[PDB]
Design a protein around this ligand. Structure first.
Ligand SMILES: [Zn+2]
Lengths: 278, 95, 143
Protein backbone atom coordinates (compact mmCIF):
# COMPACT_ATOMS: atom_id res chain seq x y z
CA UNK A 1 0.00 0.00 0.00
CA UNK A 2 1.38 3.37 1.09
CA UNK A 3 4.77 3.60 2.80
CA UNK A 4 5.84 5.68 5.79
CA UNK A 5 9.16 5.62 7.68
CA UNK A 6 9.30 2.52 9.85
CA UNK A 7 10.79 2.91 13.33
CA UNK A 8 12.39 0.18 15.40
CA UNK A 9 12.08 0.84 19.08
CA UNK A 10 14.37 -1.73 20.67
CA UNK A 11 14.10 -3.29 24.06
CA UNK A 12 17.48 -2.85 25.71
CA UNK A 13 17.31 -6.52 26.67
CA UNK A 14 17.39 -7.14 22.93
CA UNK A 15 20.62 -5.13 22.74
CA UNK A 16 22.05 -7.25 25.54
CA UNK A 17 20.92 -10.53 24.01
CA UNK A 18 22.31 -9.55 20.61
CA UNK A 19 25.73 -8.67 22.02
CA UNK A 20 25.81 -11.73 24.29
CA UNK A 21 24.41 -14.21 21.75
CA UNK A 22 26.77 -13.01 19.04
CA UNK A 23 29.61 -12.87 21.54
CA UNK A 24 29.06 -16.53 22.33
CA UNK A 25 28.41 -16.97 18.63
CA UNK A 26 32.12 -16.78 18.33
CA UNK A 27 32.90 -16.88 14.54
CA UNK A 28 30.24 -19.36 13.57
CA UNK A 29 27.46 -16.81 12.72
CA UNK A 30 24.54 -17.85 14.96
CA UNK A 31 20.84 -17.49 14.20
CA UNK A 32 18.18 -16.20 16.56
CA UNK A 33 14.70 -14.75 16.45
CA UNK A 34 12.82 -11.52 17.14
CA UNK A 35 9.59 -11.63 19.14
CA UNK A 36 7.51 -8.48 19.18
CA UNK A 37 4.35 -6.41 18.85
CA UNK A 38 2.43 -5.04 15.86
CA UNK A 39 1.71 -1.43 16.72
CA UNK A 40 1.49 0.11 13.22
CA UNK A 41 3.32 0.37 9.92
CA UNK A 42 5.74 3.15 10.82
CA UNK A 43 6.88 1.96 14.26
CA UNK A 44 7.78 -1.27 15.99
CA UNK A 45 8.74 -1.81 19.60
CA UNK A 46 10.40 -5.15 20.18
CA UNK A 47 9.86 -6.33 23.73
CA UNK A 48 11.56 -9.74 23.87
CA UNK A 49 14.56 -11.32 22.15
CA UNK A 50 15.57 -14.79 23.32
CA UNK A 51 18.13 -17.34 22.16
CA UNK A 52 18.03 -19.99 19.45
CA UNK A 53 20.23 -23.11 19.45
CA UNK A 54 23.39 -23.34 17.39
CA UNK A 55 23.23 -25.24 14.10
CA UNK A 56 26.49 -26.09 12.34
CA UNK A 57 25.09 -26.89 8.87
CA UNK A 58 24.24 -23.55 7.36
CA UNK A 59 22.39 -20.54 8.73
CA UNK A 60 18.89 -21.30 7.54
CA UNK A 61 15.18 -21.02 8.13
CA UNK A 62 15.04 -24.83 8.08
CA UNK A 63 17.04 -24.86 11.32
CA UNK A 64 14.15 -22.95 12.92
CA UNK A 65 12.30 -25.74 14.66
CA UNK A 66 8.70 -24.54 15.15
CA UNK A 67 8.03 -27.03 17.95
CA UNK A 68 11.12 -25.71 19.72
CA UNK A 69 9.28 -22.39 19.49
CA UNK A 70 6.06 -24.04 20.66
CA UNK A 71 7.74 -25.59 23.70
CA UNK A 72 9.91 -22.60 24.64
CA UNK A 73 7.12 -20.07 24.19
CA UNK A 74 4.79 -22.58 25.88
CA UNK A 75 6.96 -22.27 28.96
CA UNK A 76 6.85 -18.52 28.34
CA UNK A 77 3.03 -18.47 28.00
CA UNK A 78 2.22 -18.09 31.67
CA UNK A 79 5.68 -16.53 32.15
CA UNK A 80 5.17 -12.82 31.68
CA UNK A 81 3.41 -12.28 28.38
CA UNK A 82 3.97 -13.89 24.96
CA UNK A 83 3.65 -12.12 21.63
CA UNK A 84 4.29 -12.75 17.94
CA UNK A 85 7.67 -13.70 16.54
CA UNK A 86 8.23 -10.67 14.34
CA UNK A 87 11.64 -11.49 12.93
CA UNK A 88 15.09 -12.97 13.26
CA UNK A 89 18.80 -12.24 13.35
CA UNK A 90 22.07 -13.60 12.03
CA UNK A 91 25.59 -12.55 12.85
CA UNK A 92 28.83 -11.31 11.31
CA UNK A 93 30.77 -10.91 14.55
CA UNK A 94 34.13 -9.61 13.33
CA UNK A 95 33.42 -7.27 10.44
CA UNK A 96 30.84 -4.52 10.25
CA UNK A 97 27.93 -5.48 7.98
CA UNK A 98 26.67 -6.62 4.59
CA UNK A 99 23.39 -7.95 3.22
CA UNK A 100 23.79 -11.70 3.36
CA UNK A 101 22.41 -14.50 1.26
CA UNK A 102 20.94 -15.81 4.52
CA UNK A 103 18.67 -12.78 4.11
CA UNK A 104 17.41 -14.09 0.77
CA UNK A 105 17.12 -17.56 2.31
CA UNK A 106 14.93 -16.76 5.32
CA UNK A 107 13.52 -13.30 4.59
CA UNK A 108 10.98 -14.47 2.02
CA UNK A 109 10.09 -17.20 4.53
CA UNK A 110 9.47 -14.78 7.38
CA UNK A 111 7.71 -12.23 5.18
CA UNK A 112 5.44 -15.07 4.15
CA UNK A 113 4.97 -16.04 7.79
CA UNK A 114 5.18 -12.65 9.51
CA UNK A 115 4.56 -9.17 8.12
CA UNK A 116 7.27 -6.75 9.28
CA UNK A 117 9.99 -9.45 9.13
CA UNK A 118 13.01 -7.30 9.91
CA UNK A 119 16.45 -8.61 8.95
CA UNK A 120 19.15 -7.92 11.56
CA UNK A 121 22.93 -7.69 10.98
CA UNK A 122 25.25 -7.47 13.99
CA UNK A 123 28.89 -6.92 15.01
CA UNK A 124 30.43 -6.41 18.49
CA UNK A 125 33.90 -5.22 17.46
CA UNK A 126 33.71 -1.53 16.64
CA UNK A 127 33.51 -0.27 20.25
CA UNK A 128 32.73 -1.37 23.81
CA UNK A 129 30.57 1.48 25.19
CA UNK A 130 29.76 4.05 22.48
CA UNK A 131 28.34 2.80 19.16
CA UNK A 132 25.22 1.34 17.48
CA UNK A 133 27.02 -1.36 15.47
CA UNK A 134 23.93 -3.57 14.83
CA UNK A 135 22.23 -3.13 11.47
CA UNK A 136 18.74 -3.90 10.23
CA UNK A 137 16.87 -3.82 6.92
CA UNK A 138 13.91 -5.29 5.03
CA UNK A 139 13.37 -6.82 1.59
CA UNK A 140 11.42 -4.85 -1.02
CA UNK A 141 8.91 -6.40 -3.41
CA UNK A 142 9.62 -6.51 -7.12
CA UNK A 143 6.04 -5.41 -7.81
CA UNK A 144 6.44 -1.80 -6.61
CA UNK A 145 8.85 -1.01 -9.49
CA UNK A 146 6.03 0.74 -11.37
CA UNK A 147 6.04 3.26 -8.52
CA UNK A 148 9.07 5.51 -8.37
CA UNK A 149 10.73 4.74 -5.04
CA UNK A 150 10.83 8.29 -3.63
CA UNK A 151 7.85 8.88 -1.28
CA UNK A 152 8.54 9.31 2.44
CA UNK A 153 6.26 11.41 4.62
CA UNK A 154 8.72 12.30 7.42
CA UNK A 155 12.04 12.86 5.75
CA UNK A 156 13.89 13.89 8.92
CA UNK A 157 14.61 10.27 9.71
CA UNK A 158 15.56 9.46 6.14
CA UNK A 159 17.66 12.61 6.41
CA UNK A 160 19.22 10.90 9.42
CA UNK A 161 19.33 7.34 7.98
CA UNK A 162 20.65 8.16 4.52
CA UNK A 163 22.88 10.69 6.34
CA UNK A 164 25.67 8.26 7.50
CA UNK A 165 26.62 7.80 3.78
CA UNK A 166 25.78 4.09 3.49
CA UNK A 167 28.87 2.03 3.39
CA UNK A 168 29.51 -0.72 0.86
CA UNK A 169 27.28 -3.68 0.10
CA UNK A 170 24.01 -2.15 1.30
CA UNK A 171 23.95 0.15 -1.69
CA UNK A 172 25.63 -2.67 -3.51
CA UNK A 173 22.15 -4.14 -2.84
CA UNK A 174 19.83 -1.12 -2.74
CA UNK A 175 17.51 -3.33 -4.78
CA UNK A 176 15.78 -6.18 -2.85
CA UNK A 177 16.06 -3.99 0.25
CA UNK A 178 14.83 -0.84 1.89
CA UNK A 179 16.26 0.54 5.08
CA UNK A 180 14.69 1.05 8.48
CA UNK A 181 15.37 3.32 11.44
CA UNK A 182 16.62 1.88 14.73
CA UNK A 183 16.67 4.19 17.71
CA UNK A 184 17.11 3.25 21.35
CA UNK A 185 13.91 4.02 23.18
CA UNK A 186 13.40 5.56 26.63
CA UNK A 187 15.21 3.17 29.00
CA UNK A 188 16.17 5.61 31.71
CA UNK A 189 15.56 3.45 34.81
CA UNK A 190 18.18 1.09 33.45
CA UNK A 191 20.28 3.90 32.00
CA UNK A 192 20.82 5.67 35.30
CA UNK A 193 21.48 2.44 37.15
CA UNK A 194 24.10 1.25 34.66
CA UNK A 195 25.61 4.75 34.82
CA UNK A 196 25.73 4.20 38.60
CA UNK A 197 27.10 0.67 38.19
CA UNK A 198 29.62 1.81 35.61
CA UNK A 199 31.27 4.60 37.56
CA UNK A 200 30.72 2.48 40.67
CA UNK A 201 31.95 -0.81 39.17
CA UNK A 202 33.59 -0.24 35.77
CA UNK A 203 35.62 2.52 37.36
CA UNK A 204 37.49 0.98 40.33
CA UNK A 205 36.76 1.81 43.96
CA UNK A 206 33.35 1.28 45.49
CA UNK A 207 33.85 4.65 47.22
CA UNK A 208 34.02 3.27 50.76
CA UNK A 209 37.15 1.68 49.48
CA UNK A 210 39.35 4.43 48.15
CA UNK A 211 39.48 6.76 51.17
CA UNK A 212 48.91 4.67 46.07
CA UNK A 213 48.89 7.58 48.45
CA UNK A 214 52.64 7.50 49.10
CA UNK A 215 54.47 4.95 46.97
CA UNK A 216 52.73 6.56 44.03
CA UNK A 217 54.48 9.74 45.15
CA UNK A 218 57.83 8.00 45.22
CA UNK A 219 57.13 6.91 41.65
CA UNK A 220 55.63 10.32 40.97
CA UNK A 221 58.68 12.21 42.10
CA UNK A 222 60.54 9.86 39.78
CA UNK A 223 58.02 11.17 37.25
CA UNK A 224 58.46 14.76 38.36
CA UNK A 225 62.15 14.57 37.85
CA UNK A 226 62.36 12.45 34.69
CA UNK A 227 59.58 14.29 32.86
CA UNK A 228 60.99 17.57 34.18
CA UNK A 229 64.48 17.40 32.67
CA UNK A 230 62.97 16.56 29.29
CA UNK A 231 60.67 19.53 29.73
CA UNK A 232 63.91 21.42 30.30
CA UNK A 233 66.13 20.18 27.48
CA UNK A 234 63.71 20.96 24.66
CA UNK A 235 62.60 24.65 24.85
CA UNK A 236 66.20 25.84 24.97
CA UNK A 237 66.07 25.11 21.22
CA UNK A 238 63.04 27.31 20.58
CA UNK A 239 63.16 30.08 17.97
CA UNK A 240 65.79 32.17 19.75
CA UNK A 241 66.76 33.76 16.43
CA UNK A 242 64.86 36.17 14.17
CA UNK A 243 63.97 33.64 11.46
CA UNK A 244 60.74 33.82 9.49
CA UNK A 245 60.80 30.10 8.79
CA UNK A 246 57.41 28.40 9.03
CA UNK A 247 57.69 24.58 9.30
CA UNK A 248 57.16 23.07 12.75
CA UNK A 249 57.61 19.54 13.95
CA UNK A 250 54.94 19.08 16.59
CA UNK A 251 55.51 17.59 20.04
CA UNK A 252 53.58 19.95 22.40
CA UNK A 253 55.83 19.63 25.42
CA UNK A 254 54.07 21.37 28.35
CA UNK A 255 53.63 18.35 30.74
CA UNK A 256 51.38 20.34 33.09
CA UNK A 257 48.26 18.34 33.80
CA UNK A 258 50.05 15.25 35.10
CA UNK A 259 51.74 17.42 37.74
CA UNK A 260 48.50 19.29 38.42
CA UNK A 261 46.02 16.47 38.91
CA UNK A 262 48.52 14.04 40.48
CA UNK A 263 49.54 16.60 43.07
CA UNK A 264 45.98 17.66 43.83
CA UNK A 265 45.53 13.94 44.52
CA UNK A 266 48.68 13.97 46.65
CA UNK A 267 47.62 16.95 48.73
CA UNK A 268 44.03 15.93 49.32
CA UNK A 269 45.16 12.37 50.03
CA UNK A 270 47.72 13.70 52.48
CA UNK A 271 44.63 15.33 53.89
CA UNK A 272 43.19 11.86 54.67
CA UNK A 273 44.46 11.81 58.27
CA UNK A 274 42.91 15.15 59.21
CA UNK A 275 39.88 14.40 56.99
CA UNK A 276 38.81 10.88 57.94
CA UNK A 277 40.36 11.29 61.36
CA UNK A 278 38.45 14.14 63.09
CA UNK B 1 9.47 25.42 11.55
CA UNK B 2 9.41 21.61 11.70
CA UNK B 3 7.89 20.35 8.49
CA UNK B 4 9.24 16.86 7.77
CA UNK B 5 7.21 15.49 10.69
CA UNK B 6 4.05 16.44 8.80
CA UNK B 7 4.38 17.80 5.26
CA UNK B 8 1.17 19.98 5.33
CA UNK B 9 2.91 22.11 7.99
CA UNK B 10 4.62 23.70 4.97
CA UNK B 11 1.55 25.79 4.12
CA UNK B 12 1.20 28.00 7.16
CA UNK B 13 3.75 30.66 6.24
CA UNK B 14 1.55 31.53 3.24
CA UNK B 15 -1.09 32.60 5.76
CA UNK B 16 1.37 35.18 7.12
CA UNK B 17 1.29 37.54 4.10
CA UNK B 18 0.60 41.28 4.02
CA UNK B 19 0.71 43.32 0.78
CA UNK B 20 3.28 46.12 0.91
CA UNK B 21 0.90 48.90 -0.06
CA UNK B 22 -0.79 52.03 1.28
CA UNK B 23 -4.41 53.13 1.68
CA UNK B 24 -5.04 56.87 1.43
CA UNK B 25 -8.76 56.26 1.09
CA UNK B 26 -11.26 58.73 2.57
CA UNK B 27 -14.68 57.17 1.90
CA UNK B 28 -14.87 53.38 1.75
CA UNK B 29 -14.83 53.06 -2.05
CA UNK B 30 -14.47 56.69 -3.23
CA UNK B 31 -11.47 56.70 -5.54
CA UNK B 32 -9.15 59.69 -4.93
CA UNK B 33 -7.10 61.68 -7.41
CA UNK B 34 -3.75 61.45 -5.60
CA UNK B 35 -0.42 60.54 -7.23
CA UNK B 36 2.46 61.52 -4.95
CA UNK B 37 6.12 60.70 -5.21
CA UNK B 38 9.37 59.70 -3.56
CA UNK B 39 12.84 61.14 -4.10
CA UNK B 40 14.36 57.72 -4.75
CA UNK B 41 15.76 55.98 -7.83
CA UNK B 42 13.72 54.31 -10.58
CA UNK B 43 15.68 51.08 -10.12
CA UNK B 44 14.95 50.86 -6.39
CA UNK B 45 11.35 51.17 -7.54
CA UNK B 46 11.88 48.50 -10.23
CA UNK B 47 10.63 45.05 -9.18
CA UNK B 48 10.83 41.89 -11.35
CA UNK B 49 12.04 58.11 -13.18
CA UNK B 50 13.11 59.52 -9.82
CA UNK B 51 9.52 60.09 -8.69
CA UNK B 52 7.02 57.54 -7.39
CA UNK B 53 3.51 57.19 -8.81
CA UNK B 54 0.41 55.98 -6.95
CA UNK B 55 -2.72 54.45 -8.42
CA UNK B 56 -5.79 56.17 -6.81
CA UNK B 57 -7.16 53.38 -4.51
CA UNK B 58 -6.45 49.52 -5.56
CA UNK B 59 -3.48 50.23 -3.29
CA UNK B 60 0.00 50.54 -4.82
CA UNK B 61 2.96 48.23 -4.21
CA UNK B 62 6.04 49.70 -2.58
CA UNK B 63 9.09 48.79 -0.58
CA UNK B 64 8.40 49.06 3.16
CA UNK B 65 11.48 51.29 3.34
CA UNK B 66 10.13 53.41 0.45
CA UNK B 67 7.42 54.85 2.69
CA UNK B 68 9.57 57.01 4.97
CA UNK B 69 10.99 58.80 1.91
CA UNK B 70 7.80 60.09 0.29
CA UNK B 71 6.46 63.65 -0.01
CA UNK B 72 2.85 64.79 0.35
CA UNK B 73 1.13 66.35 -2.70
CA UNK B 74 0.88 70.06 -1.85
CA UNK B 75 -0.65 70.70 -5.29
CA UNK B 76 -3.36 68.03 -5.03
CA UNK B 77 -7.06 68.56 -4.50
CA UNK B 78 -7.23 65.63 -2.05
CA UNK B 79 -4.69 66.17 0.69
CA UNK B 80 -4.10 63.60 3.44
CA UNK B 81 -3.97 64.78 7.04
CA UNK B 82 -2.86 61.72 9.00
CA UNK B 83 0.87 61.06 8.44
CA UNK B 84 1.55 58.06 6.22
CA UNK B 85 4.97 56.79 7.25
CA UNK B 86 4.27 53.13 6.38
CA UNK B 87 1.51 50.98 4.84
CA UNK B 88 -1.98 50.63 6.15
CA UNK B 89 -4.80 53.16 6.12
CA UNK B 90 -4.99 56.93 6.73
CA UNK B 91 -7.64 59.59 6.22
CA UNK B 92 -7.94 61.87 3.21
CA UNK B 93 -10.01 65.04 2.82
CA UNK B 94 -12.35 65.73 -0.12
CA UNK B 95 -11.37 69.31 -0.92
CA UNK C 1 -25.63 54.56 9.52
CA UNK C 2 -23.11 53.77 12.19
CA UNK C 3 -25.49 50.89 12.94
CA UNK C 4 -24.72 49.53 9.48
CA UNK C 5 -21.06 50.38 10.10
CA UNK C 6 -20.91 48.29 13.29
CA UNK C 7 -22.64 45.54 11.33
CA UNK C 8 -19.93 45.72 8.67
CA UNK C 9 -16.69 46.38 10.59
CA UNK C 10 -16.56 43.06 12.41
CA UNK C 11 -17.31 41.35 9.11
CA UNK C 12 -14.22 43.00 7.67
CA UNK C 13 -14.56 42.32 3.98
CA UNK C 14 -12.90 45.43 2.60
CA UNK C 15 -9.33 44.56 3.64
CA UNK C 16 -9.76 41.03 2.24
CA UNK C 17 -11.08 42.15 -1.12
CA UNK C 18 -8.65 45.07 -1.41
CA UNK C 19 -5.93 42.46 -0.88
CA UNK C 20 -7.64 40.36 -3.57
CA UNK C 21 -7.96 43.38 -5.87
CA UNK C 22 -4.31 44.28 -5.29
CA UNK C 23 -3.11 40.83 -6.20
CA UNK C 24 -5.38 40.34 -9.21
CA UNK C 25 -4.17 43.71 -10.52
CA UNK C 26 -0.57 43.19 -9.36
CA UNK C 27 0.59 39.86 -10.80
CA UNK C 28 4.19 41.04 -11.23
CA UNK C 29 5.44 37.45 -11.32
CA UNK C 30 6.97 35.02 -13.83
CA UNK C 31 5.77 31.71 -15.24
CA UNK C 32 8.95 31.08 -17.28
CA UNK C 33 11.04 30.27 -14.19
CA UNK C 34 8.10 28.15 -13.05
CA UNK C 35 8.58 26.19 -16.28
CA UNK C 36 12.38 26.10 -15.74
CA UNK C 37 11.61 24.29 -12.49
CA UNK C 38 8.37 22.59 -13.65
CA UNK C 39 10.56 20.44 -15.89
CA UNK C 40 12.29 18.92 -12.82
CA UNK C 41 9.95 15.98 -12.38
CA UNK C 42 10.39 13.69 -9.37
CA UNK C 43 7.76 11.59 -7.56
CA UNK C 44 8.63 13.17 -4.19
CA UNK C 45 7.62 16.34 -2.37
CA UNK C 46 8.57 18.54 -5.39
CA UNK C 47 4.89 18.60 -6.42
CA UNK C 48 4.07 20.36 -3.15
CA UNK C 49 6.98 22.73 -3.76
CA UNK C 50 5.63 23.72 -7.17
CA UNK C 51 2.02 24.18 -6.07
CA UNK C 52 3.07 26.12 -3.00
CA UNK C 53 5.47 28.24 -5.08
CA UNK C 54 2.71 29.30 -7.43
CA UNK C 55 0.27 29.59 -4.54
CA UNK C 56 2.72 32.07 -2.99
CA UNK C 57 2.22 34.20 -6.09
CA UNK C 58 -1.50 33.42 -6.22
CA UNK C 59 -2.68 33.29 -2.56
CA UNK C 60 -5.42 35.85 -3.00
CA UNK C 61 -5.36 36.10 -6.79
CA UNK C 62 -8.04 33.46 -7.59
CA UNK C 63 -5.91 32.08 -10.36
CA UNK C 64 -4.49 28.63 -11.07
CA UNK C 65 -2.23 27.41 -13.78
CA UNK C 66 -0.65 24.18 -12.54
CA UNK C 67 -4.04 23.00 -11.40
CA UNK C 68 -4.98 23.51 -15.06
CA UNK C 69 -2.25 22.60 -17.54
CA UNK C 70 -1.78 18.97 -16.44
CA UNK C 71 -3.39 15.89 -14.99
CA UNK C 72 -0.73 13.15 -15.17
CA UNK C 73 2.08 15.04 -13.46
CA UNK C 74 -0.71 16.46 -11.30
CA UNK C 75 -1.73 12.91 -10.34
CA UNK C 76 1.80 11.52 -10.39
CA UNK C 77 2.37 11.33 -6.63
CA UNK C 78 -0.13 9.71 -4.30
CA UNK C 79 -2.13 10.33 -1.13
CA UNK C 80 -0.17 13.42 -0.03
CA UNK C 81 0.15 15.47 -3.19
CA UNK C 82 -3.64 15.14 -3.43
CA UNK C 83 -3.92 16.67 0.06
CA UNK C 84 -1.59 19.46 -1.04
CA UNK C 85 -3.24 19.94 -4.44
CA UNK C 86 -6.71 20.44 -3.05
CA UNK C 87 -5.09 22.51 -0.29
CA UNK C 88 -3.55 24.85 -2.86
CA UNK C 89 -7.06 25.72 -4.03
CA UNK C 90 -7.69 26.95 -0.50
CA UNK C 91 -4.37 28.76 -0.29
CA UNK C 92 -4.88 30.50 -3.64
CA UNK C 93 -8.54 31.26 -2.92
CA UNK C 94 -7.83 32.40 0.59
CA UNK C 95 -9.02 35.96 0.37
CA UNK C 96 -12.14 34.81 -1.48
CA UNK C 97 -13.89 34.36 1.85
CA UNK C 98 -17.62 33.84 1.36
CA UNK C 99 -17.58 32.83 -2.31
CA UNK C 100 -14.82 30.19 -2.08
CA UNK C 101 -17.29 27.82 -0.37
CA UNK C 102 -19.42 27.74 -3.49
CA UNK C 103 -16.18 27.64 -5.47
CA UNK C 104 -15.59 24.34 -3.66
CA UNK C 105 -19.26 23.35 -3.82
CA UNK C 106 -18.04 20.94 -6.47
CA UNK C 107 -14.96 20.16 -4.37
CA UNK C 108 -16.62 18.96 -1.19
CA UNK C 109 -14.68 16.20 0.62
CA UNK C 110 -17.30 13.54 -0.23
CA UNK C 111 -18.15 14.61 -3.80
CA UNK C 112 -14.95 13.81 -5.66
CA UNK C 113 -13.62 10.48 -4.39
CA UNK C 114 -14.12 8.23 -1.34
CA UNK C 115 -10.83 6.50 -2.23
CA UNK C 116 -8.32 8.93 -0.71
CA UNK C 117 -9.26 10.04 2.78
CA UNK C 118 -6.40 12.51 2.56
CA UNK C 119 -8.12 14.07 -0.45
CA UNK C 120 -11.23 14.58 1.68
CA UNK C 121 -8.96 15.82 4.46
CA UNK C 122 -7.21 18.37 2.29
CA UNK C 123 -10.70 19.44 1.26
CA UNK C 124 -11.74 20.61 4.72
CA UNK C 125 -8.17 21.81 5.23
CA UNK C 126 -8.79 24.11 2.26
CA UNK C 127 -12.11 25.14 3.80
CA UNK C 128 -10.04 26.11 6.82
CA UNK C 129 -7.98 28.12 4.36
CA UNK C 130 -11.26 29.65 3.20
CA UNK C 131 -11.81 30.55 6.84
CA UNK C 132 -8.13 31.30 7.36
CA UNK C 133 -7.68 33.61 10.38
CA UNK C 134 -11.00 35.47 9.88
CA UNK C 135 -13.89 33.02 9.63
CA UNK C 136 -17.60 33.69 9.78
CA UNK C 137 -20.83 31.85 10.45
CA UNK C 138 -19.45 28.79 8.62
CA UNK C 139 -16.85 28.22 11.33
CA UNK C 140 -19.63 26.44 13.19
CA UNK C 141 -20.82 24.82 9.96
CA UNK C 142 -17.39 23.33 9.30
CA UNK C 143 -17.75 22.24 12.93
ZN1 LIG D 1 25.93 -13.02 9.40
Amino acid sequence: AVDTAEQVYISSLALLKMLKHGRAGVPMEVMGLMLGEFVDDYTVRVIDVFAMPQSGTGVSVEAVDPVFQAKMLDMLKQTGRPEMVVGWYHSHPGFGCWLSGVDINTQQSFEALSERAVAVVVDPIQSVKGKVVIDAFRLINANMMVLGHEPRQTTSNLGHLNKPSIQALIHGLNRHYYSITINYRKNELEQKMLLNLHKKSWMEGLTLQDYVVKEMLELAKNYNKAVEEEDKMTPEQLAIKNVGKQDPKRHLEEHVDVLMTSNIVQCLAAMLDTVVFK
Amino acid sequence: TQFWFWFPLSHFLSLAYTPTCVIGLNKDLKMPKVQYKSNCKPSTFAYPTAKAKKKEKNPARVMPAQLKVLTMPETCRYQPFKPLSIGGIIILKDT
Amino acid sequence: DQTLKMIKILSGEMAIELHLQFLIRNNNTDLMILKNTKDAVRNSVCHTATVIANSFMHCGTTSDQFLRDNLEWLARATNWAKFTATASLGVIHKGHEKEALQLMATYLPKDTSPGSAYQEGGGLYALGLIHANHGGDIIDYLL
